[PDB]
Enzyme design. Structure first.
Site, PDB file in Angstrom:
ATOM      1  N   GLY A  14     -32.602   2.924   4.613  1.00  0.00           N
ATOM      2  CA  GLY A  14     -31.488   3.863   4.769  1.00  0.00           C
ATOM      3  C   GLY A  14     -31.811   4.628   5.993  1.00  0.00           C
ATOM      4  CD  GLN A  38     -33.560   9.600   8.505  1.00  0.00           C
ATOM      5  OE1 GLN A  38     -32.812   9.078   7.706  1.00  0.00           O
ATOM      6  NE2 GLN A  38     -34.824   9.234   8.631  1.00  0.00           N
ATOM      7  CB  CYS A  42     -38.293   9.843   4.692  1.00  0.00           C
ATOM      8  SG  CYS A  42     -37.004  10.493   5.799  1.00  0.00           S
ATOM      9  CG  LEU A  43     -37.267   5.065   8.520  1.00  0.00           C
ATOM     10  CD1 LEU A  43     -36.006   4.440   9.153  1.00  0.00           C
ATOM     11  CD2 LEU A  43     -38.384   4.050   8.369  1.00  0.00           C
ATOM     12  CG  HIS A  70     -33.954   9.476   0.819  1.00  0.00           C
ATOM     13  ND1 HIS A  70     -35.276   9.761   0.552  1.00  0.00           N
ATOM     14  CD2 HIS A  70     -33.852   9.384   2.173  1.00  0.00           C
ATOM     15  CE1 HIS A  70     -35.928   9.890   1.703  1.00  0.00           C
ATOM     16  NE2 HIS A  70     -35.089   9.657   2.702  1.00  0.00           N
ATOM     17  CD  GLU A  71     -31.169   7.718   4.235  1.00  0.00           C
ATOM     18  OE1 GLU A  71     -30.976   8.436   5.255  1.00  0.00           O
ATOM     19  OE2 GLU A  71     -32.309   7.396   3.902  1.00  0.00           O
ATOM     20  CG  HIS A  82     -31.769  12.666   5.844  1.00  0.00           C
ATOM     21  ND1 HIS A  82     -32.940  13.306   6.179  1.00  0.00           N
ATOM     22  CD2 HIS A  82     -32.130  11.393   5.521  1.00  0.00           C
ATOM     23  CE1 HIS A  82     -33.971  12.479   6.038  1.00  0.00           C
ATOM     24  NE2 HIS A  82     -33.506  11.305   5.663  1.00  0.00           N
TER      25      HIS A  82
END
Ligand SMILES: Cc1nc(-c2cccc(N)c2)cs1
Ligand SMILES: Cc1nc(-c2cccc(N)c2)cs1
Lengths: 161, 161
Positions: free
Chosen positions: B46, B51, B90-91, B132-133, B136
């Site tokens: 994701g 991000q 998470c990236l 999760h996404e 953000h």
């Protein structure tokens, strides 16, 4: 001899460490020696024995000047209720930091490695270092103490005050 | 074009993102394109527009198979109170993961980039990805949702279930 520092995620950071029972011994003096050397190579201001996978109530710390100190069987007592926020990082959590509330004033006690008693009152950064290192003896790392997750991030990226 | 992913600590992750107002446009299609490409190069499941420092209610996700999806103006509704724990990374927080409670069942709505409406019920990992996404879009990262800090650590080191 420089030891490997274990990183967050390793269960050995999550243990409650038993006391040191070998004050004044050559085995302790060597371990303390290695810890100062390990702390120095990693550019730390504090390091606790469980960060090098040694399960003992022992920490080194120091370098406002904080005195170079080795401390076995630490016990800590807040001297007030004033909390204070400050930046903290940790060699087992490389690249990150956060703002953490700590007691501004403490007394700490225990023993130098030759077995002489140590007791000091401490404030500010000196206080904070000892509280942080003490946490490790008890299986605790600073993220579980963050209250403002806005201040938690990578060191080279962060821009909060 | 692959974009730079910003890391925890960057204030641009902490913003509440405004809506997308350019569904069906060539500018959106390109941005979505870049996001899938960025997500792919980083081996993500994701990725949300903030991000890559683009302040918009937009996320891509997918790869149990989760369908490849681009989603603008997401809104989410739990379908029950069952929480479930699962591993998340998470990236923007590279090398780490933790166990996080998420709703097991959700519905989510918003728009594909061509402007067709999207609404789906989701469960398990699919559900968790979208929650999760979504976080953000709202200035939120998973550490602030950890309840058991024993499960938080580096990926190559961790050994909890
Ligand atoms: C200004 C900073 N202090 C630290 C720090 C603070 C408390 C304890 C330890 N072990 C490190 C990291 S960045
Ligand atoms: C098994 C794993 N899932 C993830 C993961 C889970 C939820 C959201 C995002 N963006 C990544 C990391 S490791």
């Amino acid at each position: 001899m420089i030891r490997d520092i274990i990183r967050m995620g390793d269960k050995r950071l999550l243990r409650v460490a038993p006391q040191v029972t070998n004050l004044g011994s050559a085995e302790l003096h060597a371990l303390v020696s290695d810890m100062f050397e390990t702390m120095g190579a990693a550019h730390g201001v504090g390091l606790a024995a469980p960060q090098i996978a040694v399960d003992l109530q022992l920490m080194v710390f120091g370098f406002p000047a904080v005195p170079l100190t080795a401390l076995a069987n630490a016990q800590i007592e807040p001297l007030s209720d004033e909390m204070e926020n400050g930046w903290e990082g940790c060699l087992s959590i490389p690249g990150l930091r956060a703002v953490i509330p700590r007691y501004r004033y403490i007394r700490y006690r225990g023993f130098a490695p030759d077995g002489s008693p140590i007791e000091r009152e401490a404030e500010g950064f000196h206080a904070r270092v000892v509280q942080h290192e003490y946490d490790h003896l008890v299986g605790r790392l600073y993220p579980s103490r963050i209250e403002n997750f806005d201040t938690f991030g990578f060191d080279d990226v962060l821009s909060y005050d």
